[PDB]
Design a protein around this ligand. Structure first.
Ligand SMILES: [Ca+2]
Ligand SMILES: [Ca+2]
Ligand SMILES: [Ca+2]
Lengths: 7, 692
């Protein structure tokens, strides 16, 4: 899936 | 009053009488139209030659700046001694000629380059076949067609006829077009392919997703026009693919303007289609057009899929790029601000920037006449809402070549896109604990031409991690957002010889400085589209106090002579860092090469089977002497190839070579001359000759 990987 | 709707139309008079016309006027003297034929079937030469035969639409569809055939039938044979008529193309509710939305098309003897006109090419009984030529800067949209017959009492015009409505699109095949794309395979993939592949996943686990762009399906072209109508985009700007791609960037998302797609990442997707359910763009656009409301829901690849359809439908070549580890800058300082708690976990309150496992956007292909030469070609455009650009969620067109060198001052939104592909990760606790310079933008890809494989295009956005240029370009991007002056100039640069690049430094302070710099030398098309980098150097230089210093860079002929084309120019980037102060000085300049001339004259009659004389003249253009000058003469139908050698040609001296020829192929033939010597090489001249 499109996800935040930092912050 | 704004003329900003293609769907709106005005009523044009059919009997446009002027003054006080007496009763009993007899208009039977004048032509009237009985029938208009556009040869609009999808097997016929108009749609096939204009590459529009794939659209399901049954109206005529043509691309601007290219000829198409129509045929007008009159009540009697057209007679230019008594008759005068014109064709008119009209778009919008308030057409004006000086805005390009009322286009008169005169009947002309010969078509003129780049100008609207129509030429009579055949006459049979009461009909005339017309070759009509549109301007390559024409507004893109759906036009109403009219035939206007002129009389002493005013104009007599055909009735509104929806069957002659005519679509005019962008033309990647026309070389006067701002979207010209000189490679046929790239036109097939970036315009005519309605199926694509979109990459996602993570860098070491790359996944692929099919996508039906469907720009040719019934209703899709009309929807793209409706999108621009929904944006209230002025019709007169719709022939500019910079304005069309920036409007599309805003209108594909629902923020600000009732655009196509509502974004959502909340894992629930109440009252809508969840983003991973879509497999193409058509159901979104057709639902947007019938509902006249935003469609729920999308994420980055869905925004890009729909954006790609909009662009390819209108004839702007476009592709979708996937960026792995994509940074979203929230405070426009061009770096990822990540705040950690003393514990070590990411403080989620102070941290507003973020980086994503991947992100997708579009590139649109166009010239950039609003930027210096060298910045055309692929432009990044993003329809995923991320940051406001001048008050709306939109992004670009940002020149990919301007991003590479960090010249982010050039519009539009180039700082943000640069931060997406190469920002530094700055971990702050406020004590800065670590910096990661290699994580953001690890890999940028797009579907390869003619297959479903991955094309790695990272090097188009950024230099390779670890190289000094990657640092210098980033410091440039940051500076744009020591008392040392830097300039450069290229000394007398003649096509076919080496030349020197002169970078000068002026140090007005009392300090000694160390400088680190790079040099990028590039070949560019005449329209300003980049072609290739042919030389790249990093160098170090020490700068004594109160001094001028020149660093001379030799560009050998072999480095650039293999990648030239007509009217191509050279584009240079120089960026120096003053090491002691971290100050950065950046410049970009273009130059045109001096072209030596070779005049070819012919003396005698030019008839197949009698002797004529060719005279090749050449002037040494240098302040130096040329040795072992071989001159060559090629003439496919006129002469077997021939050579003359000159051991020496003095400076500014002129030699002449007379050659006896006897042509054996009558028609339009051509003579070509070449010159190569020890220094200046591969200079040419040409002459067209008519042979009887
Ligand atoms: Ca929007
Ligand atoms: Ca930031
Ligand atoms: Ca980097």
């Amino acid at each position: 899936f499109x996800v935040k990987v930092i912050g | 009053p704004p003329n900003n709707s293609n769907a709106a139309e005005d009523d044009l008079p059919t009997v446009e009488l002027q003054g006080v016309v007496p009763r009993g006027v007899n208009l039977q003297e004048f032509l009237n139209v009985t029938s208009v034929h556009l040869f609009k079937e999808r097997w016929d030469t108009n749609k096939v030659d204009h590459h529009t035969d794939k659209y399901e639409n049954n109206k005529l569809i043509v691309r601007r700046g290219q000829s198409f055939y129509v045929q007008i039938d009159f009540s009697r044979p057209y007679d230019p001694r008594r008759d005068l008529f014109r064709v008119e193309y009209v778009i919008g509710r308030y057409p004006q000629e000086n805005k390009g939305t009322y286009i008169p098309v005169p009947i002309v003897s010969e078509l003129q380059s780049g100008k609207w006109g129509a030429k009579i090419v055949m006459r049979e009984d009461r009909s005339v076949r017309l070759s009509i030529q549109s301007s390559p800067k024409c507004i893109v949209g759906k036009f109403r067609m009219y035939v206007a017959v002129w009389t002493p009492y005013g104009v007599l015009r055909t009735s509104r006829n929806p069957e002659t409505d005519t679509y005019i699109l962008f033309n990647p095949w026309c070389e006067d077009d701002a979207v010209y794309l000189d490679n046929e395979k790239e036109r097939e993939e970036y315009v005519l392919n309605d199926i694509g592949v979109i990459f996602y996943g993570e860098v070491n686990d790359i996944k692929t997703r099919s996508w039906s762009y469907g720009q040719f399906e019934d209703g899709i072209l009309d929807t793209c026009l409706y999108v621009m109508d929904r944006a209230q985009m002025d019709l007169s700007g719709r022939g500019n693919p910079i304005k069309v791609s920036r409007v599309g960037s805003a209108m594909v998302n629902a923020k600000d303007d009732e655009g196509v797609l509502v974004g959502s990442w909340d894992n629930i997707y109440a009252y809508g289609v969840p983003p991973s359910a879509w497999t193409g763009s058509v159901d979104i656009l057709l639902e947007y057009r019938s509902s006249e409301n935003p469609v729920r829901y999308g994420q980055c690849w869905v925004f890009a899929g729909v954006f790609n359809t909009f662009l390819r439908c209108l004839g702007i070549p476009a592709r979708i790029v996937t960026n792995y580890f994509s940074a979203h800058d929230n405070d426009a300082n061009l770096q990822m601000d990540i705040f950690l708690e003393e514990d070590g976990n990411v403080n989620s309150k102070l941290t507003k920037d973020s980086v994503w496992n991947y992100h997708c956007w579009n590139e649109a292909w166009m010239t950039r006449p609003d930027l210096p030469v060298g910045f055309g070609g692929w432009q990044a455009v993003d329809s995923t809402p991320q940051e406001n650009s001048d008050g709306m969620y939109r992004c670009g067109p940002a020149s990919v070549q301007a991003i590479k060198h960090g010249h982010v001052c050039f519009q539009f939104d180039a700082p943000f896109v640069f931060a997406e592909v190469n920002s530094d990760l700055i971990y702050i606790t406020h004590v800065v604990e670590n910096v990661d310079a290699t994580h953001i933008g690890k890999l940028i890809v797009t579907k390869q031409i003619g297959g479903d494989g991955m094309m790695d295009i990272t090097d188009t956005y950024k230099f390779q991690e670890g190289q000094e240029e990657e640092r210098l370009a980033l410091e440039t991007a940051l500076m744009y957002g020591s008392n040392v002056d830097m300039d450069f100039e290229v000394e007398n640069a003649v096509l076919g010889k080496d030349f020197k690049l002169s970078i000068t430094f002026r140090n007005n302070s009392h300090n000694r400085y160390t400088i680190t710099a790079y040099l990028s030398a590039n070949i560019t098309f005449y329209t300003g589209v980049p072609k290739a980098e042919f030389k790249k150097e990093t160098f170090d230089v020490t700068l004594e106090p109160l001094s001028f210093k020149k660093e001379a860079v030799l560009i050998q002929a072999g480095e650039y002579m293999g990648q030239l084309l007509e009217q191509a120019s050279l584009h240079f980037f120089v960026t120096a860092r003053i090491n002691e102060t971290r100050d950065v000085l950046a410049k970009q300049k273009s130059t045109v090469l001096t072209i030596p001339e070779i005049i070819i004259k012919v003396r005698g009659t030019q008839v197949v089977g009698s002797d004529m004389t060719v005279i090749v003249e050449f002037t040494n253009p240098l302040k130096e002497t040329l040795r072992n000058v071989w001159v060559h003469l090629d003439g496919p139908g006129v002469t077997r190839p021939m050579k003359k050698m000159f051991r020496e040609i003095r400076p500014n001296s002129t030699v002449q070579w007379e050659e006896v020829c006897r042509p054996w192929v009558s028609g339009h033939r051509k003579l070509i001359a070449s010159m190569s010597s020890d220094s200046l090489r591969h200079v040419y001249g040409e002459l067209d000759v008519q042979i009887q």
